Symmetry: D2
Subunit: 57 residues, 4 copies
């Protein structure tokens, strides 16, 4: 599996079967962006995971 | 597998075979702490993962 | 003005008239802790700011 | 003073005399972007602060 990871495409470890992408703003001037390979999402974050190459663009 | 996750103990998803704990300070007044279940660590973060119950305390 | 800043006590710059302390969980495994000298808070966070020495313990 | 703040232009509080913009990667999958009005920078980050309208694009 390959995933986007902040400007590059990376090959996942064999135990990471998903790509992930999520973002949040804890404060109006601070953005946090999570993006890369991952294991399964929580159910509440089900749509933040996908499992095909480069799907988390 | 069970891991600490910021004050609680959680049961990992079956595809998460590790517990993880890492911290960083991007600025002197900001601490980020990552703690919970995970998949395998990067080699550069090898000692941030462990694979026994509650090992990431 | 002096403020706590992650285990230490620091002297604020003269244009920073507040101390600040807040914590949150942008993601379930990620804890953010913001503590130290500060300029004025947003209106809704006015109680996270204080203006007396070491008030942000 | 007016500053960029993640896609918008905002007016600073009167005690915030600077605009700020910086980004970093605390962890390989985590990008942090800090942009908006600010008090004075740390000495080593003096070039991340500026004091003219919209200077932090």
């Amino acid at each position: 599996l390959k995933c986007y990871q902040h400007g590059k495409v990376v090959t996942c470890h064999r135990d990471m079967k998903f790509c992930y992408h999520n973002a949040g703003m804890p404060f109006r001037n601070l953005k946090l962006i999570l993006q890369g390979c991952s294991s399964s999402c929580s159910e509440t974050e089900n749509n933040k995971c996908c499992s095909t190459d480069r799907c988390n663009k």
